[PDB]
Amino acid sequence: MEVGMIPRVYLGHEWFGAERILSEYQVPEDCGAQVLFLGIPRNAPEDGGNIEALEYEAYPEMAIKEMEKIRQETIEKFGVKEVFIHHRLGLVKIGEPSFLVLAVGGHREETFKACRYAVDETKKRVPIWKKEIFK
């Protein structure tokens, strides 16, 4: 995707990815910590080990609005400088990240907390659900 600036909140069938975000985002002089979480579809033995991919769907408008709300809360609550919350829609192969959260802050203490908060809240409140694709 070609954009003027990488969106902080993204929900779509395309993807920017950790490499591009980390490469393009300029860390502010007052920030000394970045904590990135990548959620990846698994094909663990406990699920049969026959999963080839996951298909993600959502209520697009509702989801992105709630995602932005969580981002706002994360920044205000932990005092970090920036937070990215991205999630893919459509087909996602096992091993490919489908969920991304990047927190940028002054120190690691609050940056780790910020990332974990955004990740946990997103899972509890954002309307995005998966479907397994077998074989």
Binding residues for substrate: 40-42, 107-108, 123, 130-132
Of 22, 38, 40, 62, which one interacts with Cl ion (CB under 5 A)? Answer: 62
Pairing of strands 51-58, 90-93: antiparallel
Pairing of strands 82-88, 99-105: antiparallel
Of 6-25, which residues contact its own copies (CB under 8 A)?
Answer: 18-19, 22-23
Return the closest-CA partner of residue 82 out of 105, 108, 60. Answer: 105
Check if the beta carbon of residue 106 is closer than 8 Å to that of residue 82.
no
Nearer to Cl ion, 66 or 121 (CB): 66
Could you give phi then psi for residue 121, rounded to 5 degrees?
A: -65, -40
Return the closest-CA partner of residue 21 out of 80, 86, 65. Answer: 86
Query: Which does residue 48 touch among its own copies, Cl ion, Na ion, none (CB within 5 to 8 A, set by kind)?
Result: none
Of 6, 7, 12, 39, which one interacts with its own copies (CB under 8 A)? Answer: 39
Build a one-symbol-per-residue string for 31-60: x at contacts with Cl ion by CB under 5 A, - elsewhere.
----------------------------xx
The distance of Cα 96 from the centroid of its chain, to the nearest Å, equals: 13
Residues within the annotated binding site? 40-42, 107-108, 123, 130-132
Q: Does 3 bind its own copies (CB under 8 A)?
A: no
Q: Enumerate binding residues for Na ion (CB under 5 A).
A: 17-18, 97
